[PDB]
Amino acid sequence: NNNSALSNVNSDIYFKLKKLEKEYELLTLQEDYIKDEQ
Amino acid sequence: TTAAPLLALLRENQDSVKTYALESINNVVDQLWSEISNELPDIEALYDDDTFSDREMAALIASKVYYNLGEYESAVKYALAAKDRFDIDEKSQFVETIVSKSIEMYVQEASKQYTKDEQFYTKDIIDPKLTSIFERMIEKCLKASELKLALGIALEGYRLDIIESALKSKLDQDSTSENVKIINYLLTLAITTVTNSKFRSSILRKSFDFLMNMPNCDYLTLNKVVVNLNDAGLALQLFKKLKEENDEGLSAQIAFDLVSSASQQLLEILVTELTAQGYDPALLNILSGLPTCDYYNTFLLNNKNIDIGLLNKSKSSLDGKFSLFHTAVSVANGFMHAGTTDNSFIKANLPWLGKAQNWAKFTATASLGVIHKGNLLEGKKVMAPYLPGSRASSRFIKGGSLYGLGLIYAGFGRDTTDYLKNIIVENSGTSGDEDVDVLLHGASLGIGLAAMGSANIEVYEALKEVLYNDSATSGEAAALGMGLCMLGTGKPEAIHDMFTYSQETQHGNITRGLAVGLALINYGRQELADDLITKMLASDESLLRYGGAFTIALAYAGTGNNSAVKRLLHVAVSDSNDDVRRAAVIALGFVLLRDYTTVPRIVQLLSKSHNAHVRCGTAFALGIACAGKGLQSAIDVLDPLTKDPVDFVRQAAMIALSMILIQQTEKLNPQVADINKNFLSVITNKHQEGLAKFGACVAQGIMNAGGRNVTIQLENADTGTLDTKSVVGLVMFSQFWYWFPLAHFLSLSFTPTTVIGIRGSDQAKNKYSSKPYKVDNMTRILPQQSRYISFIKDDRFVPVRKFKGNNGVVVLRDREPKEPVALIETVRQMKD
Amino acid sequence: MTAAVTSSNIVLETHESGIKPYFEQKIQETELKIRSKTENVRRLEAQRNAL
Amino acid sequence: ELLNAETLCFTVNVLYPDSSSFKKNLLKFITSNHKSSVPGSAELRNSYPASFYSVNTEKKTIEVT
Amino acid sequence: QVFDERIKFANQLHDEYLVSMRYPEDKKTQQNEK
């Protein structure tokens, strides 16, 4: 556009998202465990 | 308008009228889908028939109706059963839902077919249509721009060959920095996303080769692949490329970087190959590791700043007569004087030292090997007055001098190993006498440090006999030392021998020591050590379950695995022995060194529980995981545990905080000052138990450690990869309650932070401003500070790289090489 | 820089960029799923905190 | 209340690629209105950032429509 | 059979309250307060 290389960084957001959402599966790990703890 | 004619035309008998029916249904289906959802079998019937060539047109309708219905999976099958008139909808962005569902299906299938063979897309293992679709969807990525979109898609689909071709399209030197960054993202992604061993290894290995093809590249990225896979062959090939790019500064810079990052196994193998290939002795001298030990000594000398009132206050309150008091001071004192010969405290407070006795005096002797750590030329000549054959006043001094010898030479003690092995084989035939017993104990700890990460089978033999001797106190050191020497080899004879011997022996100290040692020797064994883990947890002995936790911890250390973490959570809650509950919590920080952001939340639950041991192990898990530069959540959870009404939780907490806030200035964070001040309030007070005072004195000495020059590093910023040495220090420290001398193993986690610029032609919150201030070479530089340091635009010394922004050796280019300028002197030069 | 007289991306990357939310469809459908997890994992935390 | 020409004015205040043109047509049908509905007598922006700073709207592309 | 249909209405009320009760509580504790 007015700042090029706006097709590499757009795929880095996608990369990061696939990491984060497994770190929210680390909360679904905890989820079963707070049932087992109580 | 109405579906009634369109239903009726399918039921009307004539072949032409049935074909006309399809034509109307296909054009208007976003208003009429509900009615023809019920009459779907008629649409499938015309497709089955071969008397039509609009059998395809009927299959296309079925997909459309399923898309409005909500059954997106079955739409794909009938979309691919039409085969044409599906390109019309592949360039529709309002129904690209079915086009995307085909790719979502491909990924699930592919995880299965990679364990049958790595190739299943150049073979008939799956539908040919699904493969063809996958690559046309990746073709769309390249219309947008930039292979990068396609690379994330192909990773999940287990397409190795796609990844190679994309990256070679960027091997024409469009721009070398950009081309390396394109590879760089995929390196970090591969560690954190795919844990499949086969696929992960391939991506790093192919990337490593594309980097070599380019003449100019980051040699950070090349360094990462070699260390992660820990392959000496890749390291050798790296230097094959440097054989044709050989100059003193370039070839040395990568060598300095490599020794810090690489494991002990990788260096041992690599140097010999360079010797057979033929290479300068200057490189081989770096890769031995001696130069970098000398440079750390010089840095400590220059910046030796020791606040003297800490020692005076602690000395007066923690009396030398009481064993617990004296040891607390000794452990803080050795940390304080680590790496610089400081015997001034010893001279000044000789009466207080003279109050020491039984194992407190052994601790005092072992303090020496922290103080004189490093300084390897004088390291055997400064313990000589205390080594056997020069002392007979007490056996504690004769024994703890050998333990401190191993500290001094830890990590480079291949010659020290020989000394202590002789002492062991002599005194492995008798351990019933008092003198022999204390003597043998320090030797067995010493040789664990001296042979650490060397896996000497001579050392295994020697300590195996001490174990079989059934010594009263040396069996504990023998077990631990063997796991130090045999680190992460996982030999089946050793495991089986040790697993049975804890049953065989009835001594309490030995059974603890073998439980812990089994974890050490199975460090980094993830699924290979799985079976041992199962056996130890299933044991109803308190002892084997205590170690059971740490075999998971060290097997899966620094791995983002749910199963590794999962198992530890289970033990903590479900087990009704307190010591076993504590061990499960501590272990958590080791698995989650790689990511410690999430850690305080997991143990938030555990701190709510009011059992002393559970809260006690919560403190340690937080100290371990969130050491280095702090985390606000970590601080918060520990604060109530500092004020706990139970001494055991208080002692744990004060220390854990000092790791999180290690060497952080109180002008950069006000909370550090309060926490510092709290420790001092206890050290002064003489109305609390010695347990609280023990933990306060030590915690304060940890904060100020090394003369305020060292910090805890878990993962280097040199490559962003875990340190082997770090993990070993910390887990040994956690055993200090049971046996006090083990405190000293913490020194393995203290590492100096400084930027040492070296002339490579002879080897000689939110503070920011646009106004610089100037800083000298080789002074204390915190990681916060590193990112704000930048070499001057016009400078006599300019780094070959553009500065990495983190502590370590950076090789400089000297603009004028014939000018003599002041040099900072090396300890090696000082002596002789 | 801002307007509406001059179309963004001087129009070449608005239909070569609408193929992209379908690469990302998988994670954002999943992202919805997560929003309910977060609620839940504190929901059961309060129960055990009281207990 | 307070005459029926307020909607046309509100459009001129905010950015418009074609939004002013579209709103004119609707008011036209109910007996045209363009008085104090043109920049300088329906403009409240003149270097105001909540209504899209004027310099930034002249300058180049990305939409806020 | 009659009693069971009544117990099933009671059990429906037991599910409905449990889910919704903590949910406004979790957002409100997220958000900052004194």
PDB file of N, CA, C and O in Angstrom, chain B residues 47-91:
ATOM      1  N   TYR B  47     -28.149 -38.794  -9.861  1.00  0.00           N
ATOM      2  CA  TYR B  47     -26.690 -38.834  -9.897  1.00  0.00           C
ATOM      3  C   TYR B  47     -26.177 -40.258 -10.091  1.00  0.00           C
ATOM      4  O   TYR B  47     -25.210 -40.482 -10.827  1.00  0.00           O
ATOM      5  N   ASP B  48     -26.809 -41.233  -9.433  1.00  0.00           N
ATOM      6  CA  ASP B  48     -26.368 -42.618  -9.564  1.00  0.00           C
ATOM      7  C   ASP B  48     -26.483 -43.095 -11.005  1.00  0.00           C
ATOM      8  O   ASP B  48     -25.635 -43.857 -11.485  1.00  0.00           O
ATOM      9  N   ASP B  49     -27.518 -42.654 -11.709  1.00  0.00           N
ATOM     10  CA  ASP B  49     -27.768 -43.145 -13.053  1.00  0.00           C
ATOM     11  C   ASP B  49     -26.664 -42.705 -14.003  1.00  0.00           C
ATOM     12  O   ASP B  49     -26.081 -41.628 -13.863  1.00  0.00           O
ATOM     13  N   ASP B  50     -26.383 -43.562 -14.982  1.00  0.00           N
ATOM     14  CA  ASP B  50     -25.429 -43.262 -16.038  1.00  0.00           C
ATOM     15  C   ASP B  50     -26.123 -42.856 -17.328  1.00  0.00           C
ATOM     16  O   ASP B  50     -25.453 -42.638 -18.343  1.00  0.00           O
ATOM     17  N   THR B  51     -27.449 -42.747 -17.314  1.00  0.00           N
ATOM     18  CA  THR B  51     -28.209 -42.296 -18.468  1.00  0.00           C
ATOM     19  C   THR B  51     -28.297 -40.781 -18.529  1.00  0.00           C
ATOM     20  O   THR B  51     -29.026 -40.241 -19.369  1.00  0.00           O
ATOM     21  N   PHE B  52     -27.570 -40.090 -17.658  1.00  0.00           N
ATOM     22  CA  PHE B  52     -27.506 -38.641 -17.642  1.00  0.00           C
ATOM     23  C   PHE B  52     -26.048 -38.210 -17.625  1.00  0.00           C
ATOM     24  O   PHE B  52     -25.180 -38.916 -17.102  1.00  0.00           O
ATOM     25  N   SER B  53     -25.789 -37.043 -18.208  1.00  0.00           N
ATOM     26  CA  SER B  53     -24.513 -36.364 -18.058  1.00  0.00           C
ATOM     27  C   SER B  53     -24.667 -35.146 -17.165  1.00  0.00           C
ATOM     28  O   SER B  53     -23.676 -34.462 -16.882  1.00  0.00           O
ATOM     29  N   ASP B  54     -25.892 -34.862 -16.724  1.00  0.00           N
ATOM     30  CA  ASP B  54     -26.171 -33.963 -15.619  1.00  0.00           C
ATOM     31  C   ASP B  54     -26.385 -34.728 -14.316  1.00  0.00           C
ATOM     32  O   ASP B  54     -26.986 -34.197 -13.375  1.00  0.00           O
ATOM     33  N   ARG B  55     -25.919 -35.981 -14.256  1.00  0.00           N
ATOM     34  CA  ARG B  55     -25.706 -36.635 -12.971  1.00  0.00           C
ATOM     35  C   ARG B  55     -24.810 -35.776 -12.095  1.00  0.00           C
ATOM     36  O   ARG B  55     -24.966 -35.736 -10.869  1.00  0.00           O
ATOM     37  N   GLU B  56     -23.855 -35.090 -12.721  1.00  0.00           N
ATOM     38  CA  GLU B  56     -23.028 -34.128 -12.007  1.00  0.00           C
ATOM     39  C   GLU B  56     -23.869 -32.972 -11.482  1.00  0.00           C
ATOM     40  O   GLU B  56     -23.711 -32.554 -10.329  1.00  0.00           O
ATOM     41  N   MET B  57     -24.775 -32.446 -12.315  1.00  0.00           N
ATOM     42  CA  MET B  57     -25.583 -31.304 -11.900  1.00  0.00           C
ATOM     43  C   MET B  57     -26.406 -31.645 -10.666  1.00  0.00           C
ATOM     44  O   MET B  57     -26.641 -30.780  -9.816  1.00  0.00           O
ATOM     45  N   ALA B  58     -26.832 -32.903 -10.543  1.00  0.00           N
ATOM     46  CA  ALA B  58     -27.560 -33.321  -9.352  1.00  0.00           C
ATOM     47  C   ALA B  58     -26.641 -33.392  -8.139  1.00  0.00           C
ATOM     48  O   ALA B  58     -27.029 -32.994  -7.035  1.00  0.00           O
ATOM     49  N   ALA B  59     -25.419 -33.896  -8.321  1.00  0.00           N
ATOM     50  CA  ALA B  59     -24.474 -33.950  -7.211  1.00  0.00           C
ATOM     51  C   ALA B  59     -24.142 -32.552  -6.712  1.00  0.00           C
ATOM     52  O   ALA B  59     -23.997 -32.331  -5.504  1.00  0.00           O
ATOM     53  N   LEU B  60     -24.019 -31.595  -7.633  1.00  0.00           N
ATOM     54  CA  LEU B  60     -23.745 -30.219  -7.238  1.00  0.00           C
ATOM     55  C   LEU B  60     -24.874 -29.665  -6.376  1.00  0.00           C
ATOM     56  O   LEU B  60     -24.623 -28.969  -5.385  1.00  0.00           O
ATOM     57  N   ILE B  61     -26.126 -29.972  -6.731  1.00  0.00           N
ATOM     58  CA  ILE B  61     -27.264 -29.498  -5.944  1.00  0.00           C
ATOM     59  C   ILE B  61     -27.185 -30.033  -4.518  1.00  0.00           C
ATOM     60  O   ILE B  61     -27.452 -29.306  -3.552  1.00  0.00           O
ATOM     61  N   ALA B  62     -26.804 -31.305  -4.357  1.00  0.00           N
ATOM     62  CA  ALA B  62     -26.795 -31.911  -3.028  1.00  0.00           C
ATOM     63  C   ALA B  62     -25.860 -31.169  -2.087  1.00  0.00           C
ATOM     64  O   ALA B  62     -26.193 -30.937  -0.918  1.00  0.00           O
ATOM     65  N   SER B  63     -24.676 -30.803  -2.574  1.00  0.00           N
ATOM     66  CA  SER B  63     -23.757 -30.008  -1.770  1.00  0.00           C
ATOM     67  C   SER B  63     -24.396 -28.687  -1.359  1.00  0.00           C
ATOM     68  O   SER B  63     -24.299 -28.269  -0.199  1.00  0.00           O
ATOM     69  N   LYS B  64     -25.063 -28.020  -2.303  1.00  0.00           N
ATOM     70  CA  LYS B  64     -25.678 -26.727  -2.017  1.00  0.00           C
ATOM     71  C   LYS B  64     -26.716 -26.850  -0.910  1.00  0.00           C
ATOM     72  O   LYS B  64     -26.764 -26.027   0.012  1.00  0.00           O
ATOM     73  N   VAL B  65     -27.550 -27.886  -0.979  1.00  0.00           N
ATOM     74  CA  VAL B  65     -28.603 -28.063   0.016  1.00  0.00           C
ATOM     75  C   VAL B  65     -28.004 -28.387   1.380  1.00  0.00           C
ATOM     76  O   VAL B  65     -28.501 -27.928   2.416  1.00  0.00           O
ATOM     77  N   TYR B  66     -26.933 -29.182   1.407  1.00  0.00           N
ATOM     78  CA  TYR B  66     -26.291 -29.495   2.677  1.00  0.00           C
ATOM     79  C   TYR B  66     -25.641 -28.264   3.291  1.00  0.00           C
ATOM     80  O   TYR B  66     -25.591 -28.136   4.520  1.00  0.00           O
ATOM     81  N   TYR B  67     -25.143 -27.350   2.455  1.00  0.00           N
ATOM     82  CA  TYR B  67     -24.521 -26.135   2.969  1.00  0.00           C
ATOM     83  C   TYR B  67     -25.541 -25.262   3.693  1.00  0.00           C
ATOM     84  O   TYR B  67     -25.249 -24.717   4.764  1.00  0.00           O
ATOM     85  N   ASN B  68     -26.750 -25.125   3.135  1.00  0.00           N
ATOM     86  CA  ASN B  68     -27.791 -24.385   3.844  1.00  0.00           C
ATOM     87  C   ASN B  68     -28.299 -25.160   5.051  1.00  0.00           C
ATOM     88  O   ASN B  68     -28.708 -24.554   6.048  1.00  0.00           O
ATOM     89  N   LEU B  69     -28.275 -26.492   4.985  1.00  0.00           N
ATOM     90  CA  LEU B  69     -28.790 -27.298   6.083  1.00  0.00           C
ATOM     91  C   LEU B  69     -27.941 -27.121   7.334  1.00  0.00           C
ATOM     92  O   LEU B  69     -28.468 -26.925   8.434  1.00  0.00           O
ATOM     93  N   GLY B  70     -26.626 -27.190   7.181  1.00  0.00           N
ATOM     94  CA  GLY B  70     -25.720 -27.055   8.300  1.00  0.00           C
ATOM     95  C   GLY B  70     -24.793 -28.246   8.398  1.00  0.00           C
ATOM     96  O   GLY B  70     -23.964 -28.329   9.309  1.00  0.00           O
ATOM     97  N   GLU B  71     -24.933 -29.178   7.457  1.00  0.00           N
ATOM     98  CA  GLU B  71     -24.110 -30.384   7.410  1.00  0.00           C
ATOM     99  C   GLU B  71     -22.974 -30.140   6.423  1.00  0.00           C
ATOM    100  O   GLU B  71     -23.006 -30.565   5.267  1.00  0.00           O
ATOM    101  N   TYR B  72     -21.946 -29.441   6.903  1.00  0.00           N
ATOM    102  CA  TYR B  72     -20.880 -28.989   6.015  1.00  0.00           C
ATOM    103  C   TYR B  72     -19.964 -30.132   5.590  1.00  0.00           C
ATOM    104  O   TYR B  72     -19.346 -30.059   4.521  1.00  0.00           O
ATOM    105  N   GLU B  73     -19.862 -31.190   6.396  1.00  0.00           N
ATOM    106  CA  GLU B  73     -18.958 -32.281   6.050  1.00  0.00           C
ATOM    107  C   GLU B  73     -19.464 -33.072   4.851  1.00  0.00           C
ATOM    108  O   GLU B  73     -18.696 -33.376   3.932  1.00  0.00           O
ATOM    109  N   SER B  74     -20.750 -33.425   4.848  1.00  0.00           N
ATOM    110  CA  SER B  74     -21.295 -34.223   3.758  1.00  0.00           C
ATOM    111  C   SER B  74     -21.407 -33.428   2.465  1.00  0.00           C
ATOM    112  O   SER B  74     -21.427 -34.026   1.384  1.00  0.00           O
ATOM    113  N   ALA B  75     -21.482 -32.099   2.551  1.00  0.00           N
ATOM    114  CA  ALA B  75     -21.496 -31.280   1.345  1.00  0.00           C
ATOM    115  C   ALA B  75     -20.224 -31.486   0.530  1.00  0.00           C
ATOM    116  O   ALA B  75     -20.262 -31.487  -0.707  1.00  0.00           O
ATOM    117  N   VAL B  76     -19.087 -31.667   1.206  1.00  0.00           N
ATOM    118  CA  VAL B  76     -17.815 -31.815   0.504  1.00  0.00           C
ATOM    119  C   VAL B  76     -17.856 -33.026  -0.411  1.00  0.00           C
ATOM    120  O   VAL B  76     -17.398 -32.978  -1.560  1.00  0.00           O
ATOM    121  N   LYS B  77     -18.396 -34.135   0.087  1.00  0.00           N
ATOM    122  CA  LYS B  77     -18.386 -35.367  -0.685  1.00  0.00           C
ATOM    123  C   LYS B  77     -19.174 -35.216  -1.980  1.00  0.00           C
ATOM    124  O   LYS B  77     -18.730 -35.669  -3.041  1.00  0.00           O
ATOM    125  N   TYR B  78     -20.341 -34.573  -1.919  1.00  0.00           N
ATOM    126  CA  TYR B  78     -21.133 -34.352  -3.122  1.00  0.00           C
ATOM    127  C   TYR B  78     -20.619 -33.184  -3.952  1.00  0.00           C
ATOM    128  O   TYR B  78     -20.933 -33.105  -5.144  1.00  0.00           O
ATOM    129  N   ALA B  79     -19.842 -32.281  -3.352  1.00  0.00           N
ATOM    130  CA  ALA B  79     -19.173 -31.249  -4.137  1.00  0.00           C
ATOM    131  C   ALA B  79     -18.109 -31.860  -5.035  1.00  0.00           C
ATOM    132  O   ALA B  79     -17.936 -31.438  -6.185  1.00  0.00           O
ATOM    133  N   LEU B  80     -17.392 -32.852  -4.524  1.00  0.00           N
ATOM    134  CA  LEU B  80     -16.363 -33.550  -5.276  1.00  0.00           C
ATOM    135  C   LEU B  80     -16.932 -34.687  -6.106  1.00  0.00           C
ATOM    136  O   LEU B  80     -16.183 -35.336  -6.844  1.00  0.00           O
ATOM    137  N   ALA B  81     -18.236 -34.938  -6.003  1.00  0.00           N
ATOM    138  CA  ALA B  81     -18.925 -35.895  -6.852  1.00  0.00           C
ATOM    139  C   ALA B  81     -19.575 -35.228  -8.055  1.00  0.00           C
ATOM    140  O   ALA B  81     -20.100 -35.928  -8.928  1.00  0.00           O
ATOM    141  N   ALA B  82     -19.562 -33.898  -8.105  1.00  0.00           N
ATOM    142  CA  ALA B  82     -19.923 -33.152  -9.301  1.00  0.00           C
ATOM    143  C   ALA B  82     -18.717 -32.925 -10.208  1.00  0.00           C
ATOM    144  O   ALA B  82     -18.847 -32.971 -11.436  1.00  0.00           O
ATOM    145  N   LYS B  83     -17.559 -32.657  -9.600  1.00  0.00           N
ATOM    146  CA  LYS B  83     -16.231 -32.531 -10.204  1.00  0.00           C
ATOM    147  C   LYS B  83     -15.991 -31.310 -11.075  1.00  0.00           C
ATOM    148  O   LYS B  83     -14.868 -30.797 -11.127  1.00  0.00           O
ATOM    149  N   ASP B  84     -17.032 -30.795 -11.702  1.00  0.00           N
ATOM    150  CA  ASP B  84     -16.951 -29.543 -12.429  1.00  0.00           C
ATOM    151  C   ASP B  84     -18.177 -28.722 -12.083  1.00  0.00           C
ATOM    152  O   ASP B  84     -19.183 -29.244 -11.596  1.00  0.00           O
ATOM    153  N   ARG B  85     -18.080 -27.425 -12.324  1.00  0.00           N
ATOM    154  CA  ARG B  85     -18.999 -26.438 -11.790  1.00  0.00           C
ATOM    155  C   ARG B  85     -18.714 -26.251 -10.307  1.00  0.00           C
ATOM    156  O   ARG B  85     -19.526 -25.644  -9.594  1.00  0.00           O
ATOM    157  N   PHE B  86     -17.582 -26.764  -9.821  1.00  0.00           N
ATOM    158  CA  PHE B  86     -17.097 -26.479  -8.481  1.00  0.00           C
ATOM    159  C   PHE B  86     -15.988 -25.433  -8.484  1.00  0.00           C
ATOM    160  O   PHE B  86     -15.706 -24.847  -7.432  1.00  0.00           O
ATOM    161  N   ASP B  87     -15.356 -25.195  -9.640  1.00  0.00           N
ATOM    162  CA  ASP B  87     -14.484 -24.033  -9.800  1.00  0.00           C
ATOM    163  C   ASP B  87     -15.275 -22.735  -9.741  1.00  0.00           C
ATOM    164  O   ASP B  87     -14.735 -21.692  -9.351  1.00  0.00           O
ATOM    165  N   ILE B  88     -16.550 -22.777 -10.135  1.00  0.00           N
ATOM    166  CA  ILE B  88     -17.403 -21.595 -10.065  1.00  0.00           C
ATOM    167  C   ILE B  88     -17.531 -21.135  -8.622  1.00  0.00           C
ATOM    168  O   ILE B  88     -17.641 -19.935  -8.345  1.00  0.00           O
ATOM    169  N   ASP B  89     -17.504 -22.081  -7.686  1.00  0.00           N
ATOM    170  CA  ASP B  89     -17.748 -21.826  -6.279  1.00  0.00           C
ATOM    171  C   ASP B  89     -16.460 -21.769  -5.476  1.00  0.00           C
ATOM    172  O   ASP B  89     -16.485 -21.362  -4.309  1.00  0.00           O
ATOM    173  N   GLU B  90     -15.344 -22.162  -6.078  1.00  0.00           N
ATOM    174  CA  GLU B  90     -14.033 -21.982  -5.486  1.00  0.00           C
ATOM    175  C   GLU B  90     -13.567 -20.539  -5.569  1.00  0.00           C
ATOM    176  O   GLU B  90     -12.740 -20.120  -4.754  1.00  0.00           O
ATOM    177  N   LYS B  91     -14.074 -19.778  -6.537  1.00  0.00           N
ATOM    178  CA  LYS B  91     -13.821 -18.348  -6.610  1.00  0.00           C
ATOM    179  C   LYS B  91     -14.989 -17.534  -6.087  1.00  0.00           C
ATOM    180  O   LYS B  91     -15.009 -16.310  -6.261  1.00  0.00           O
TER     181      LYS B  91
END
